[PDB]
């Protein structure tokens, strides 16, 4: 019927003064744009069809052509930035927002989808969507006593579009828009649908990826215990954004970090730090590094949860990027910890896997490790057990690595290494 028309045939149908002919040709355009192998998006744009699709959005007396044109425009906006810009240039943003209140849920759902693609292109289009007034009618669609009464795909598309309004930086979304969206986000964060939960965590992920004042906005809503719960989910698409949000939060103040500890997030980290997914261990260890950069009582919580042997583990065997985050976690630990905590660190076996990583080509990790070497010796001087520490390194092949680093580029490596050998290896 309308299967695999030529672009020229679609043009002649849209350019006819027959509404049913225009409807028939618009649907055929939609079918081309929704095909798997290559949608001829650029062919449809070059023929000048976007202004005509946009005009069909306003045909209130002909719902079907509203739907087909909305679907067609949605699929163009899902392409490149240039392609999305073409949809925006045709005036599609106000026309799509006007369709949010359509009595036809499938047309309103399509307008939600289209706005999601437009907002997701970048901060400029995101804020332009916001300026046109999309947030109020979007949130009104979720203003129900129970989210469970909404269609599954409809709620998922609303959640995904909202998360795009929370996404991107330079600039981050407007503060008042974040305040407006955020009570609905929190309600979506407690829904039972896994993908809704995933997109909700991504939205919180985006909102916490900024300065502490953005972070405070989110934590004042009390979402931290829910994020820790989602941190323990089995669905890996939930854990990944949940771990990101938790990691962004522990970049803020020690008080915001403390709320993550108080909510019980540290008990999940034995699993996360042995997680078979490389990125999860990798992200969990970075989060651990920002936790070990906190107060001594928060370092003590790491100790209490048995997490120091787990850091010894990732330092002994992990992906290199993960081992780099483990060194940072150790150096931060050794920088803010007590003598007892730094002593405990060596009793756990941190010295031997720390030496082994003095062989990697990365210049930064050697600086990071050597910083931690110094701090561990620094506590050994308060206990007079320095020489007894020095022999340990000599027996796991260490001094071979340090004294070799005395002849090494970037100087700063050689300075700390020669300084190291000068004081504790006489």
């Amino acid at each position: 019927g309308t299967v695999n028309w030529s672009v020229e045939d679609i043009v002649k149908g849209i350019n006819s003064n027959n509404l049913e002919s225009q409807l028939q040709a618009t649907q055929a355009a939609r079918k081309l744009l929704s095909r798997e192998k290559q949608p001829p998006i650029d062919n449809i744009i070059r023929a000048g069809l976007i202004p005509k699709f946009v005009s069909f959005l306003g045909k209130t007396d002909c719902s079907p052509i509203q739907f087909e044109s909305a679907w067609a425009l949605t699929n163009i906006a899902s392409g490149t930035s240039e392609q999305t810009k073409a949809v925006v240039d045709g005036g599609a943003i106000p026309a799509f927002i006007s369709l949010l209140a359509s009595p036809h849920a499938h047309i309103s759902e399509q307008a939600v989808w289209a706005l999601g693609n437009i907002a997701g292109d970048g901060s400029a289009f995101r804020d332009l969507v916001i300026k046109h007034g999309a947030i109020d009618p979007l949130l009104a669609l979720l203003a129900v006593p129970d989210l469970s009464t909404l269609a599954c795909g409809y709620l998922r598309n609303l959640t995904w579009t909202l998360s795009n309004l929370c996404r991107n930086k330079n600039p981050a979304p407007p503060l008042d828009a974040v305040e407006q969206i955020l009570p609905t986000l929190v309600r979506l964060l407690h829904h039972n649908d896994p993908e809704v939960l995933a997109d909700s965590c991504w939205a919180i992920s985006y909102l916490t990826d900024g300065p502490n004042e953005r972070i405070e906005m989110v934590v004042k809503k009390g979402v931290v215990p829910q994020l820790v719960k989602l941190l323990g989910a089995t669905e890996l698409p939930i854990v990944t954004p949940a771990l990101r949000a938790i990691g962004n939060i522990v970049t803020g103040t020690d008080e915001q970090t403390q709320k993550v500890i108080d909510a019980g997030a540290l008990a999940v980290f034995p699993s996360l730090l042995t997680n078979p997914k490389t990125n999860i261990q990798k992200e969990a260890t970075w989060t651990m590094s920002n936790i070990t950069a906190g107060r001594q009582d928060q370092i003590q919580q790491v100790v209490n949860h048995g997490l120091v042997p787990f850091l010894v583990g990732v330092l002994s065997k992990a992906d290199f990027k993960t081992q780099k985050e483990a060194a940072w976690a150790i150096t931060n630990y050794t920088s803010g910890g007590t003598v007892e905590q730094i002593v405990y660190l060596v009793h756990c076996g941190i010295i031997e896997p720390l030496m082994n990583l003095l062989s990697a080509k990365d210049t930064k990790i050697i600086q990071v490790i050597l910083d931690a070497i110094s701090n561990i010796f620094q506590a050994a001087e308060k206990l007079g057990e320095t020489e007894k520490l020095s022999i340990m390194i000599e027996e796991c092949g260490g001094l071979d690595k340090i004294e070799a680093l005395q002849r090494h580029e970037n100087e700063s490596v050689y300075k700390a290494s020669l300084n190291l050998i000068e004081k504790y290896f006489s």
């Binding site: 803020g252 920002n290 950069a293 803010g336």
Partner: peptide, 4 residues
């Protein structure tokens, strides 16, 4: 000493 928190980073990103």
């Amino acid at each position: 000493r928190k980073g990103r």
